[PDB]
Every structure is written in structure tokens, then in C-alpha cells.
Fold Putative ferredoxin.
Amino acid sequence: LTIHVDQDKCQGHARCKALAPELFDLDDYGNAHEKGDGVVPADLIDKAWLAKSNCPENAIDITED
Ligand code: F3S
């Protein structure tokens, strides 16, 4: 599992960042992006799917391999 935020879809709700601070960083304009790895650790797999479910703009993709 990896995370991606589509920059064109992001409108900076910051829900992703409130749910999974560990997985997203916000730029100075409030837009989110995947952090370091992008790879989702075993303990954050659920917060990942939640952040994606919760984004109002459907801006988050999770890849599965
Ligand atoms: S709008 Fe952007 S800030 Fe997060 S909650 Fe969605 S990716």
C-alpha cells in the first residue's frame, strides 16, 4: 500500500491531515501530499483507508500491491 494526493483535486480540507498526521503533510497553501515513503505501515493501514474515504474532493488514491 502507497498513498497519493492528486493536487488538482485537493481543495485543502485538511481532513486527511487531521486523521493521519503520520501520512500527509500540508504545504503553505493548505494542500496535502504524501509524506516521505508514501508506503503505509501495518499500524496505519486503517487510517489510510479512512483518510481516503473522508476526503470531500476524492483527491486520495491508495495503490495496492
Ligand atoms: S481536500 Fe486535500 S487536504 Fe486532504 S482532505 Fe482532501 S486531500
Notes: Residues 5, 10-16, 32, 55, 57, 59-60 surround FE3-S4 cluster (CB under 6 Å). The first strand starts at residue 2 and ends at 5. The two ends are 6 Å apart (CA to CA).
